[PDB]
Amino acid sequence: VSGVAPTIYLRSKAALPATSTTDVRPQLYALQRFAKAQLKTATEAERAAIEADIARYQEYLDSDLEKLKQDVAEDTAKKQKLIPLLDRYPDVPIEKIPEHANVLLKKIDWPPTPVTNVYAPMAEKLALKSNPELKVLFKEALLQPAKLLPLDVDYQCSHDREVVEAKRDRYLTALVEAEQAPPLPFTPDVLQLQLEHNVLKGELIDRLRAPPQVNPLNAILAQHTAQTPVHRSLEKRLWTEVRATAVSE
């Protein structure tokens, strides 16, 4: 590490740029250009529908996205009005069901059907990430991270100090991303899950009172995707992302 270094590797978490913005206009413009490209392969009917769509996106841009926020708010209002109506038996909550099941098994006392449990593995990660010790190290590592890395060995090993600074810079970003990362890997659509939970609750009680294992739902989405062009499917990614910001702001 030759040369009298002019500056010193002092850093602040405030100086580290942590924005995590989510822009909407460029995504919209990319949608527009994609539809423009599909126009060439489109037939006349879809050409007309796509011209209407293109004019709609240009209207959104000229009105500065307020029309789109209004539209997505309308759809989400329909959704949020829908779910409490499908809240069929609210007085009979969900944890009380296995008690009923134990009761019926006691009363009554074959190829079984399996289950795909996805949300229970993630619950195990909460048993780790929610610990106090794991957060203590986060609380004490970022404040004094030089203790962890062998900086003395690294400085002696590398003639240039720029490489050493880059290694230290990356470790913080890996740690900052770690603590701020959630247990989940994705953004769960809360409404479309409470829908299923409210419908599924509407099915178990009707089953408690009283072949193949196929899911006919998949024989509908396979038709829905076929009917729609691609730009509408991409438009769904846009509308979903706007529900995050509009609920945030």
Partner: peptide, 25 residues
């Protein structure tokens, strides 16, 4: 085969909007 709700159908609120306005009042 099993049953599915018109809400579990895709893009349901669009065609179910009338019943919603009739019901939530």
């Amino acid at each position: 085969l099993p049953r599915v709700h018109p809400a579990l159908y895709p893009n349901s609120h669009l065609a179910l909007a009338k019943e919603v306005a009739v019901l939530a009042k």
